[PDB]
Write an enzyme that holds these catalytic residues in place. Structure first.
Site, PDB file in Angstrom:
ATOM      1  N   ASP A  26       0.803  -1.155  -0.134  1.00 46.80           N
ATOM      2  CA  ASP A  26      -0.191  -0.002  -0.013  1.00 46.80           C
ATOM      3  C   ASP A  26       0.825   1.279   0.054  1.00 46.80           C
ATOM      4  O   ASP A  26       0.294   2.469   0.271  1.00 46.80           O
ATOM      5  CB  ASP A  26      -0.866   0.232   1.369  1.00 46.80           C
ATOM      6  CG  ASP A  26      -0.282   0.109   2.597  1.00 46.80           C
ATOM      7  OD1 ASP A  26       1.004  -0.023   2.583  1.00 46.80           O
ATOM      8  OD2 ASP A  26      -0.797   0.174   3.588  1.00 46.80           O
ATOM      9  N   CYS A  41       4.830   0.185   3.029  1.00 44.36           N
ATOM     10  CA  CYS A  41       5.340  -1.389   3.507  1.00 44.36           C
ATOM     11  C   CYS A  41       6.582  -1.089   4.149  1.00 44.36           C
ATOM     12  O   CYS A  41       6.702  -1.818   5.203  1.00 44.36           O
ATOM     13  CB  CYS A  41       5.705  -2.057   2.240  1.00 44.36           C
ATOM     14  SG  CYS A  41       6.734  -1.424   0.829  1.00 44.36           S
ATOM     15  N   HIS A  54       9.216  -3.309  -3.250  1.00 44.35           N
ATOM     16  CA  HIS A  54       8.686  -3.744  -2.176  1.00 44.35           C
ATOM     17  C   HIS A  54       9.290  -4.276  -1.071  1.00 44.35           C
ATOM     18  O   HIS A  54      10.342  -4.748  -1.092  1.00 44.35           O
ATOM     19  CB  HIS A  54       7.374  -4.752  -2.389  1.00 44.35           C
ATOM     20  CG  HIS A  54       6.352  -5.051  -1.539  1.00 44.35           C
ATOM     21  ND1 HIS A  54       5.271  -4.307  -1.087  1.00 44.35           N
ATOM     22  CD2 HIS A  54       6.473  -6.122  -0.253  1.00 44.35           C
ATOM     23  CE1 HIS A  54       4.541  -5.021  -0.046  1.00 44.35           C
ATOM     24  NE2 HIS A  54       5.395  -6.085   0.395  1.00 44.35           N
TER      25      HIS A  54
END
Lengths: 231, 82
Positions: free
Chosen positions: A47, A50, A223
């Site tokens: 989102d 992270c 990520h």
């Protein structure tokens, strides 16, 4: 109140993520290589938060059962409002976020469990409040050292504008500056494993340099997930 | 054979407070510089972002393109956006 794992997931053996790259020989190779040093992984929600969510959860999780380390960290957390004030944040605006973070620290202190910590970090409101606090503390660290950090900003952007637009708001992706700033702001020793699709050797970055990390993160496809080191 | 006096040193500062010193030529590209940083620090070029006076340095350009002179100082950050 149903159990959720939407923000910080349950812990699985590391080779579970081979399933995310069923047909990429390079990813598979790198993941196999990771398994020599790391035994397990937790995923975080994609989102934009992270990194902050991951660092917060994993560092607090690494404190569980360590009374001395917990106390020393609590003392540091108590000084953070002064940091926020010095950078021009207003107490009545940072209050709820500082409160959320101090509350979760106390939860860890009063003999918390992995299970109760997970419940907080998977509660949308309390988890996001912890993230927002970490974001503000990162911004404060940078603002209070603007003379140092201004040299590392591109497109001739002002430091204050940088913090306003790329550190403080929820869902804005982190980067090197934010990462090392937060690590320094809270004295959290962090190691990031860098995993790309290039047929290359693995590398990692330690913050600060040559510290023994308490947190390991996997950086892959832009990520951040949590790694657990072997013994 | 006439001597070339263009060889110089520049400095690269990092977020750890460290200053790296590089042996360069004004006609070096930014990639070449990134390659030199890799040799000294073990950071892959793809992971490097170079900045001179607040301006990001693009790969295909040269040091002279940015008016980077002898003894100039550059700033280095990693690319870790996530």
């Amino acid at each position: 109140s149903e159990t959720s794992f939407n923000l910080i997931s349950e812990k699985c053996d590391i080779l579970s993520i081979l399933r995310d790259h069923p047909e990429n020989r390079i990813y598979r190779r790198k993941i196999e290589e990771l398994s020599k040093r790391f035994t397990a992984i937790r995923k975080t929600k994609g989102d934009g938060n992270c990194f902050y969510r991951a660092l917060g959860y994993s560092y607090l999780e690494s404190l569980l059962g360590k009374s001395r380390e917990i106390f020393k960290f609590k003392e540091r957390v108590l000084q953070t409002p002064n940091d926020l004030l010095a950078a021009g944040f207003e107490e009545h605006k940072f209050r709820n976020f500082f409160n959320a973070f101090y509350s979760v620290v106390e939860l860890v202190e009063k003999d918390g469990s992995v299970s109760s910590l997970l419940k907080v970090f998977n509660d949308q409101s309390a988890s996001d409040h912890i993230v927002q606090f970490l974001r503000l503390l990162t911004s404060a660290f940078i603002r209070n050292r603007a003379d140092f950090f201004r040299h590392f900003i591109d497109e001739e952007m002002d430091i204050k504008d940088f913090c306003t637009h790329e550190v403080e708001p929820m869902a804005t992706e982190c980067d090197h500056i934010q990462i090392t700033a937060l690590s320094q702001a809270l004295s959290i020793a962090l190691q990031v494993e860098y995993v790309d699709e290039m047929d290359t050797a693995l590398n990692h970055h330690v913050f600060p340099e040559a510290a023994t990390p308490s947190v390991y993160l996997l950086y892959k496809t832009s990520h951040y997930n949590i790694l657990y080191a072997a013994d | 054979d006439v001597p070339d006096y263009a060889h110089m040193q520049i400095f690269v500062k990092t977020l750890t407070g460290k200053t790296i010193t590089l042996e360069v030529e004004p006609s070096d590209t930014i990639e070449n510089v990134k390659a030199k940083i890799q040799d000294k620090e073990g950071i892959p070029p793809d992971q490097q972002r170079l900045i001179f006076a607040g301006k990001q340095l693009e790969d295909g350009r040269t040091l002279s393109d940015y008016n980077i002179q002898k003894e100039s100082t550059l700033h280095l950050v990693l690319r870790l956006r996530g």
